[PDB]
Amino acid sequence: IQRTPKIQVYSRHPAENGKSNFLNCYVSGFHPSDIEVDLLKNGERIEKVEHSDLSFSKDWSFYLLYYTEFTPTEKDEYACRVNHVTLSQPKIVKWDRDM
Amino acid sequence: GSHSMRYFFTSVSRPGRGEPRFIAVGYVDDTQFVRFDSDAASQRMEPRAPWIEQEGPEYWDGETRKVKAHSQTHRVDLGTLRGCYNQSEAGSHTVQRMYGCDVGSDWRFLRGYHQYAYDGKDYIALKEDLRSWTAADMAAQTTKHKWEAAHVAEQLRAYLEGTCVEWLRRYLENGKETLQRTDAPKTHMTHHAVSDHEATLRCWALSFYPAEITLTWQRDGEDQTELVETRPAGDGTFQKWAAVVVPSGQEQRYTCHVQHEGLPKPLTLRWEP
Amino acid sequence: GVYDGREHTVGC
């Protein structure tokens, strides 16, 4: 009756150090709707993230998209601290520039 | 190809804290065109597409009235269903809904559907012929009997056919530069080193619309490979990648095939320096 | 344009 989310962290455009960009965290396939997502920078929470609206797939499993604005640099590390009812402990997905 | 106009509804029953949430978004193809939310103080049917804002206030008033009627019926559905399963009055339960209609290449009706769920389990739905239901369990077995006497299927079918094809044709006519567009993905391929004697090729396809696309890996003729859900880019386009673990040395024996509407011919990708 | 017909409540 309950499923676990599938988390992907990526950037809208191919990231380049110095050009404005966006960071997305697309969690899909979970149930129920009540989820907590946060976009982290250097382990700290980013204050200006905003999300799309609650849709669901053909098998009645939701999905969302949290995005914000950022500029890449070699000394900064980003992540996405997702937490759901089924997740006993939070899942901290990092952002690697090759996925 | 074809075109779609689907609606999604949700009602999460928050107990003790007040009234259930309600989000009612509407889709044309893969593009959101209208919005709703029971938490924001606007309490209107806000737009989300820069080709529907140009309509008058009677349209918005009608949409708001109908959406609030949908919310009022969802609340009663949640209450009765929670009461009917002999559950307690402290958990949170979800009710969902979906209906739409598809027009063919001639912009004439092809197929319409209308489903209904509860806690992620199918509850009731119209069949493909739009004449009978598909009740799955006992509660659905009673809902079917209740709705086969009021002729709900007939009203749903008349609405779907007439009004849905009319509205979708109007929306397609207005959104000529946005709804009737197709984008060709930009494709490139990468390389990794999983171990000291292997590799991991990865086929990328970015910024395509509509959402559907097929990526297949073929070892010089025969297909096998891990895929990912197609993911939005945040501005109307999509992204996708597919990868497979390959033994080292045999890097020229693998091909990636791309099939999209905006691509007249299939794309083959092979590794190069 | 959302469904503008009459509304019915799920029973049991």
Numbering used by the authors:
A (entry chain B): 1 to 99
B (entry chain A): 1 to 224, 228 to 276
C (entry chain C): 1 to 12
Tell me, in the authors' exact words, what the paper reports.
The recognition of antigenic peptide-MHC (pMHC) molecules by T-cell receptors (TCR) initiates the T-cell mediated immune response. TCRs are expressed as heterodimers of α/β or γ/δ chains in complex with three CD3 dimers (CD3εδ, CD3εγ, CD3ζζ) that are responsible for initiating downstream signaling. Here, we report cryoEM structures of two distinct full-length α/β TCR-CD3 complexes bound to their pMHC ligand, the cancer-testis antigen HLA-A2/MAGEA4 (230–239). We also determined cryoEM structures of pMHCs containing MAGEA4 (230–239) peptide and the closely related MAGEA8 (232–241) peptide in the absence of TCR, which provided a structural explanation for the MAGEA4 preference displayed by the TCRs.
To further investigate the structural differences between these two peptide epitopes, we conducted cryoEM analysis of MAGEA4 and MAGEA8 pMHCs in the absence of TCR. 3.4 and 3.1 Å resolution reconstructions were obtained for MAGEA4 and MAGEA8 pMHCs, respectively. The side chain of the central R6 residue was not well-resolved, consistent with its flexibility in the absence of TCR. As expected from their conserved sequences, the structures of MAGEA4 and MAGEA8 peptides were highly similar. The structures of MAGEA4 and MAGEA8 pMHCs suggest that different conformations of peptide residue D4 are key for discrimination. Taken together, our structural data indicate that preferential binding by these TCRs for MAGEA4 is likely due to interactions that require the peptide D4 to be in a down conformation where it does not interact with HLA residue 65.
